[PDB]
Amino acid sequence: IQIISSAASMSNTYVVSAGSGFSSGSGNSQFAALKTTAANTTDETAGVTTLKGAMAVMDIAETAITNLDQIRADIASIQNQVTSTINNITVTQVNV
């Protein structure tokens, strides 16, 4: 049980000190991280070694596939443009 005395002033449970970008009254005051000594938050096992870790790595891989497709499409567009330029230049050189 970790009882917060008053939501207006809680620097003993979340990291809301002045140095952090999460100072109250400065925006972002509702995204502050917990304090490892206040709570007992510990890390988790590494990566796909856990269930929710696996179901998160699934989306990370899906996004990776998305990004690589997005890049390969740009490469392909540049390539088609270059091919068209080369055909036009090949004809214009003969005419010149």
Partner 1 sequence: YKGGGKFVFTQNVSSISAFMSAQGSGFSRGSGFSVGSGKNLSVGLSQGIQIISSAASMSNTYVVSAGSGFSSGSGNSQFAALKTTAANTTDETAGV
Partner 2 sequence: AIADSLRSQANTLGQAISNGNDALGILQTADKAMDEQLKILDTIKTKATQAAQDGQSLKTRTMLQADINKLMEELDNIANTTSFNGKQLLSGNFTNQEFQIGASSNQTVKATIGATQSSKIGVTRFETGAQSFTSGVVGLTIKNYNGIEDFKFDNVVISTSVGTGLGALAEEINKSADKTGVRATYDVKTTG
Partner 3 sequence: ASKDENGKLVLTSADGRGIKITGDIGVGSGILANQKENYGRLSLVKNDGRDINISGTNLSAIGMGTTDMISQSSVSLRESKGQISATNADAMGFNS
Ligand X SMILES: C[C@H](O)[C@H](N)[C@@H]1O[C@](O)(C(=O)O)C[C@H](O)[C@@H]1N
How far apart are alpha carbons 1 and 5 in whole angstroms?
12
Among 12, 17, 34, 85, binds partner 3 (CB under 8 A): 34
Nearer to ligand X, 27 or 47 (CB): 27
Cα radius of gyration rounded to whole Å, the chain: 27
In the block, residue with structure tokens 């990566």? 47
Q: Is 69 in the site for partner 3 (CB under 8 A)?
A: no
**Smallest distance, Å, CB 4 to partner 1?**
25
Binding to partner 1 (CB under 8 A): which residues in 27-86? none
Q: Is residue 33 near partner 2 by the rule CB under 8 A?
A: no
What is the spatial distance between Cα 14 and Cα 35, in angstroms, rounded to a whole number?
5
Give whichever of 6 and 93 is closer to partner 3, judged by the CB atom.
6
Residue 57 · residue 50 · CB < 8 Å: no
